[PDB]
Design a protein around this ligand. Structure first.
Ligand code: Q7G
Ligand code: Z8A
Ligand code: PLP
Lengths: 67, 554, 406, 183
């Protein structure tokens, strides 16, 4: 092969497995929380909105749940 | 506050050559396509996602539309001083009213950072992008003068002729030395040189027609071609997914327009029969002529047109045929002749053939090919020839060099390797993506691989996350597309290699797992079973099996 | 009563069922429109129809002479002294003195420019491989836009790929059905195409006549005032800097006064006046010593005639350019220009900034050429001159008496 | 007065009752050249159950507050659905996206549905849904004719009346109450 001027960005799994960050006792809860947050946030419009309206909609959903 | 001018980088020859064009790894990574011999083209099949995705999409768009009008009404009513652009100052109307610019301001504005990105240098397999920072909400940007390379899957260079060191560049420099950069004027009083006639004859021989014409711009070619021979008493039958240039040309011509659904031939035949019977409106006199306009390959869908059926219909009903092929003149076919080569159709059946050099040959311009007794009339009846500027010399030299390279004259075995490389890359990427579990469109050979993203808020996340991985992609959405279906369009090139595709596959697999973008059914695999393969198995087994023409549904 | 409420429901249900049972019908119906037809009859109509040839070949031999007369230059740049061949290599002439070139200043052929092109070609390649919308726009394009805006005194500018398609893509963008356009008596063909595609009312006034323009503007203003329309529409005045077919110039100050009095916008297409008019060569506005940012609203120009490279540009304020970047069809659905063109044009602009000898020399030559033919007496009975003393192009016309006599 | 060479002038109504003039050749070509995107999405996949889902959610949210009464909650959800449908279908005239020239500047979305073809299945569904909602609301709980008469009046005149073919291509302009409508 021949070298080039490209800087390769490592993938998340490789970085995590070479960082020793993975810990069975105290990472499953973090992964579950991450999944719950991302699934809730992606499939519903918060990401093209404004801060005031996004906060208002968050409060609306929170009140709907609390009731 | 201003785009900085970037100083060129000084590197040895080998590094820059590798940056522009990548060397082959193994000779087993090539694929030679085979002719169809005229066997029928089956009807395409499309996969669908579950219901809840569509329901969520509908709710998202409804909420966005309501909130946009709420903000517009409140802001226009109360805070007048802030919005002075949309109000009349002194007896003068504004440049535009609020209503027609609703979609641009209300939903598109929040996504303006994923659309226009300045770059520098030659676009090869690695593209250099300028770094910028967003202020307010995509209102203006601040630039720190820093550059960084990215992999490009968004540029129109199918055969990889965009280079800074090669025979074409040498020819362009020699032409600049010999002929100056300036032209004389319209190609009827001064501005025609022997290079123009040489390019004319070379293109005419390469396509297979008898005579041709060369223009400096493609959009102008289409916008000015139609009014020369069409009139108010004629009829034009065209598809519903044609390019904008054809629509503008037909509007300027003034003829009547009827449209038929995409991919339906029974409807086309019924429409032709009815239009022949009825005649002109309000007088019911017969039409003077009927013309059929179509496209060789559609970029938004990556599907082919059924040429033999069109030829049969035009022979039976005595109609004329016009074919637009700019994405398929150099990248498709056993030898790269076009759509007329894969189907085995004789070139003399079609009346007018058009194409552009921008996509595959690395130079700007367009052409038109037809019979001698038609070109002789058109050279007089055209308005581009006698009123507009002429094509420059370096562009002609580049086009001639590219055509002689593809034809196999100047270099023995360079074009065939490019054709085989692009075919293999397209097949491998499409098969790997389908085996992962995504949804793609195509005909197993088109260089366009559209991957579908359905939720409105997933396209910016995908774009930003791919940018963080140093990959450049282009995403399109409403109204350019149907409301429900948004997509990301991949443009595969011959310059990329297999290891780049493996890197891309790993990163896209991780991002899709994170964003929940892979939802496949049994209608996409040949065995009828939904497939979710692990990544390393895909990498191990796909490149060998991608050669057999049985694993692809369409 | 209670049965009345039930009767309301019964009446609603009956209408619902009636509407459900009905069959679809459309104004643009099928063959069943006439119909008075049978399958046997329709085939007779289909077979009886005969078409017309795509193009009429009757008269091609009568006009082939103009094709046979086109000069062709062989293996040489188009310059003052050339060698031409005609009628497909049958006849050849050498050391011909060219008086048909359309490049006036001849600054693109100098050595300091031929290096900027070579360096750009070496560092960038030949052609851009994408639209301006997605990834095609580079730094040199922004640099050229800034340079043009600074040089011509306008807030912004927009680059187009070809000068023939600039006006037909700009003018329809800012007009809708229900607007008024007042155009000159004779204008070039691209302006005519723009007017046809604009889809709005068009009025014509006599050539270089201000009384007609004033009267028509007054009539329109009175009618609009009497109409009492809730929303004010858009109004434009379409003219040309130096006319293409006659070589005459338009009076600017009167147009400015009228557009300020009657609330109209001014559109000026100056292709033949960018590089030749004025002491420095800044265009028509510099000739009359007025500010461009206020006199003119839209400017359309070409880089091919004077600057010496392909393309075109439009000059205007910030809102216009911002809307144009999305609403213009030729801008959105087309690829960008090659880099050597824009780099060379920027270098030419810098050279123009440095010195101003070529403009003076060209003006002197044009004045001499006009005086030489317009000062004689023998040709008074045969031809007349319709051009202006400042134009770089001289137009000649046959006398109306000669045309009728011959 | 001076006559324009090419005339495209908007003309307004001059009577209490009026109808819009049929289109010309050039306008017909302009509309036929490019498919309309405001009326295409109604017939697509998943575009019918969405109304039912909206109704179900509106019922639940209005019933969620303890202080509401069942009759009042159903009347309020009728308010919401009828007003939303009337605003979207019959109130707004024009197209948000720009078409060639004025194009569909005079017709509403309900007129634009399915290229002005009448008695289409989508129209049948859209006219049947409010009727079914009205009967379900009436039969579900106890009611008194006081608000019942006004509720059925609103259901008829805000949902049913505009859908009749007699009101198709029809404009009403009061001299002072409603502004003049372009014909
Ligand atoms: C919990 C709480 C409950 C309550 C609540 O909050 C939440 O619930 C919230 C829910 C809200 C509603 C939600 C949804 C809508 C629909 C919307 O739809 C407008 C779309 C129309 C345009 O409307 C926009 O543009 C108008 C421009 O005039 C603005 O008007 C003036 O606005 C300002 C004065 O008001 C001043 O600036 C000026 O006087 C003037 O600009 C208006 O404000 C603005 O909305 C589109 O249609 C027109 O399009 C053209 C207009 O361009 C018309 O002209 C054309 O006519 C010919 C065609 O025939 C062509 O040929 C000609 O070329 C050409 O001239 C054409 O005729 C006609 O069809 C109108 C508003 C409404 C009802 C909201 C109200 C407020 C709420 C009740 C909130 C509320 C707060
Ligand atoms: C004390 C309590 C008192 C209660 C009083 C009740 C008051 C009720 C207030 C009603 C507020 C809502 C009224 C209007 C809200 C929606 C109106 C939106 C109209 C804006 C302009 C429409 C332009 C159409 C062009 C367009 O972009 N079209 C389409 C794409 O091309 C469009 O973008 C998509 O197809 C999406 C629309 C489909 C979503 C399904 C809607 C069907 C059901 C409507 C019910 C509304 C319920 C609101 C909660
Ligand atoms: C890409 C495209 C064009 C673009 O025109 P250019 O001026 O060459 O950039 C024209 N026609 C078709 C069919 C296209 O797909």
């Amino acid at each position: 092969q021949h070298k080039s001027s490209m800087v390769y960005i490592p993938t998340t799994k490789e970085a995590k497995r070479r960082n020793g960050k993975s810990e069975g006792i105290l990472n499953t809860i973090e992964e579950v929380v991450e999944k719950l947050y991302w699934t809730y946030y992606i499939h519903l419009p918060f990401y093209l909105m404004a801060s005031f309206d996004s906060f208002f909609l968050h409060v609306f959903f929170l009140t709907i749940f609390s009731l | 506050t201003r785009v900085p001018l970037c100083e060129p980088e000084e590197l040895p020859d080998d590094i820059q050559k590798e940056n522009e064009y990548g060397t082959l790894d193994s000779p087993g990574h090539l694929y030679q396509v085979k002719s169809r011999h005229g066997k029928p083209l089956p009807e395409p099949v499309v996969d669908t996602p579950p219901y809840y995705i569509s329901l969520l999409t509908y709710l998202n768009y409804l909420i966005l539309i309501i909130l946009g009008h709420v903000h517009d009404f409140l802001g226009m009513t109360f805070q007048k001083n802030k919005h002075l652009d949309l109000l009349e100052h002194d007896g003068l109307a504004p440049w535009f009213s609020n209503f027609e610019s609703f979609y641009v301001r209300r939903i598109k504005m929040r996504i303006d950072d994923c659309f226009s990105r300045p770059t520098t240098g030659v676009p090869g397999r690695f593209i250099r992008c300028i770094d910028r920072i967003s202020h307010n909400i995509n209102e203006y940007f601040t630039y720190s003068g820093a550059v960084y390379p990215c992999m490009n899957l968004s540029s129109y260079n199918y055969l990889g002729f965009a280079q800074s060191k090669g025979q074409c560049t040498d020819a362009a420099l020699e032409s600049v030395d010999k002929y100056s950069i300036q032209s004389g004027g319209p190609r009827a009083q001064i501005g025609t040189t022997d290079l123009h006639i040489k390019a004319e004859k070379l293109v005419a021989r390469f396509i297979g027609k008898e005579d041709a014409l060369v223009f400096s711009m493609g959009y102008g070619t289409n916008a000015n071609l139609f009014n020369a021979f069409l009139d108010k008493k004629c009829l034009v039958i065209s598809d519903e997914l044609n390019h904008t240039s054809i629509r503008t040309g037909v509007r300027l011509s003034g003829a009547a327009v009827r449209t038929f659904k995409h991919g339906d031939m029974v409807g086309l035949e019924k429409l032709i029969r009815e239009q022949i019977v009825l005649g002109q409106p309000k007088t019911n006199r017969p039409w003077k002529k009927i013309l059929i306009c179509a496209e060789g390959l559609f970029s938004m869908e990556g599907t082919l047109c059924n040429l033999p059926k069109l030829v049969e219909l035009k022979k039976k009903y005595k109609c004329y045929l016009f074919i637009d092929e700019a994405h398929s003149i150099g990248a498709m076919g056993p030898t790269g002749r076009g759509v007329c080569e894969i189907f085995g159709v004789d070139p003399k059946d079609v009346d007018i053939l058009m194409g552009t050099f921008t996509k595959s040959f690395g130079a700007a311009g367009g052409y038109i090919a037809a019979d001698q007794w038609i070109i002789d009339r058109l050279r007089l009846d055209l308005t581009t020839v006698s009123y507009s500027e002429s094509m420059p010399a370096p562009v002609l030299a580049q086009t001639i060099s590219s055509l002689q390279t593809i034809s196999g004259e100047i270099c023995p075995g360079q074009g065939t390797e490019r054709l085989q490389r692009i075919a293999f890359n397209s097949r491998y990427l499409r098969l790997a993506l389908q085996r992962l579990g995504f949804i793609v469109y195509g005909v197993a050979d088109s260089p366009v691989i559209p991957l579908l993203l359905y939720c409105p808020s997933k396209m910016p996340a995908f774009s930003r996350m791919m940018l963080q991985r140093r990959i450049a992609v282009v995403v399109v959405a409403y109204p350019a597309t149907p409301l429900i279906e948004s997509r990301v369009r991949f443009c595969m090139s011959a310059s990329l290699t297999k290891e780049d595709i493996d890197y891309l596959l790993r990163h896209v697999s991780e991002v899709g797992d994170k964003l929940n973008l892979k939802s496949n059914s049994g209608k996409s695999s040949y065995d009828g079973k939904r497939q979710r393969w692990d990544i390393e198995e895909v990498i191990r087994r796909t490149p060998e099996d991608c050669k057999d023409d049985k694993y692809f549904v369409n | 009563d209670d049965p009345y409420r039930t009767t309301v429901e019964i009446g609603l249900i009956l209408y619902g069922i009636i509407y459900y049972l009905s069959k679809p019908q459309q104004k643009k119906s099928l063959q069943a429109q006439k119909p008075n037809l049978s399958p046997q009859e329709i085939d007779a109509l289909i077979e009886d129809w005969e078409p017309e040839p795509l193009v009429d070949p009757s008269a091609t031999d009568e006009q082939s002479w103009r094709v046979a007369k086109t000069p062709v230059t062989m293996e040489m740049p188009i310059q003052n002294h050339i060698t031409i061949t005609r009628n497909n290599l049958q006849e050849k002439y050498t050391n011909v003195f060219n008086l048909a070139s359309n490049n006036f200043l001849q600054l693109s052929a100098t050595e300091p420019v031929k290096e900027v092109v070579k360096t750009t070609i070496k560092n960038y390649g030949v052609g851009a491989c994408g639209p301006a919308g997605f990834y095609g726009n580079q730094d040199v394009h922004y640099t050229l836009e800034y340079d043009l805006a600074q040089f011509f005194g306008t807030q912004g500018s927009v680059l187009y790929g070809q000068d023939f398609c600039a006006a037909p893509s700009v003018l329809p963008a800012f007009t809708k059905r229900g607007d008024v356009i007042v155009a000159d008596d004779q204008v070039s063909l691209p302006v005519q195409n723009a007017l046809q595609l604009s889809r709005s009312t068009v009025y014509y006034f006599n050539h270089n006549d201000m009384n007609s323009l004033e009267c028509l503007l007054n009539e329109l203003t009175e009618q609009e005032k009497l109409e009492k329309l809730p929303a004010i529409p858009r109004k434009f005045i379409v003219t040309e800097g130096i006319f293409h077919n006659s070589g005459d110039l338009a009076p600017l100050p009167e147009l400015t006064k009228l557009k300020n009095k009657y609330k109209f916008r001014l559109f000026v297409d100056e292709t033949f006046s960018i590089g030749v008019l004025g002491a420095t060569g800044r265009g028509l506005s510099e000739h009359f010593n007025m500010d461009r940012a206020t006199a003119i609203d839209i400017t359309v120009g070409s880089m091919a005639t004077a600057l010496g490279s392909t393309g075109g540009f439009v000059l205007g304020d910030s809102v216009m350019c911002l809307h144009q970047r999305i609403g213009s069809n030729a801008y959105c659905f087309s690829a960008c220009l090659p880099a050597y063109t824009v780099t060379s044009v920027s270098k030419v602009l810098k050279l123009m900034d440095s010195n101003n000898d070529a403009v003076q020399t060209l003006q002197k030559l044009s004045k001499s050429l006009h005086d030489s033919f317009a000062s004689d007496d023998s040709l008074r009975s045969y031809v007349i001159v319709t051009s202006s003393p400042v134009s770089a192009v001289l137009h000649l016309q046959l006398t109306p008496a000669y045309r009728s006599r011959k | 007065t001076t006559e324009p060479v090419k005339d495209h002038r908007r003309r307004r109504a001059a009577a209490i009752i009026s109808h819009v003039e049929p289109e010309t050749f050039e306008d017909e070509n302009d509309q036929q050249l490019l498919p309309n995107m405001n009326a295409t999405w109604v017939d697509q996949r998943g575009a019918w159950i969405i109304h039912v889902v909206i109704i179900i959610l509106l019922k639940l949210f209005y019933n969620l507050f303890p202080g509401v009464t069942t009759e009042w909650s159903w009347t309020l959800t009728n308010m919401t659905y009828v007003i939303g449908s009337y605003v979207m279908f019959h109130l707004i005239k024009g197209t948000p996206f720009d078409f060639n020239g004025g194009a569909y500047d005079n017709l509403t979305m309900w007129e634009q549905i399915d290229d002005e073809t009448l008695y289409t299945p989508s129209r049948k569904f859209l006219i049947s849904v409010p009727i079914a909602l009205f009967l379900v609301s009436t039969h579900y709980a106890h009611y008194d004719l006081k608000l019942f008469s006004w509720n059925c009046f609103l259901t008829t005149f805000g949902a049913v009346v505009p859908k009749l073919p007699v009101t198709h291509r029809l404009r009403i302009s009061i001299p002072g109450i409603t502004g003049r409508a372009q014909i």
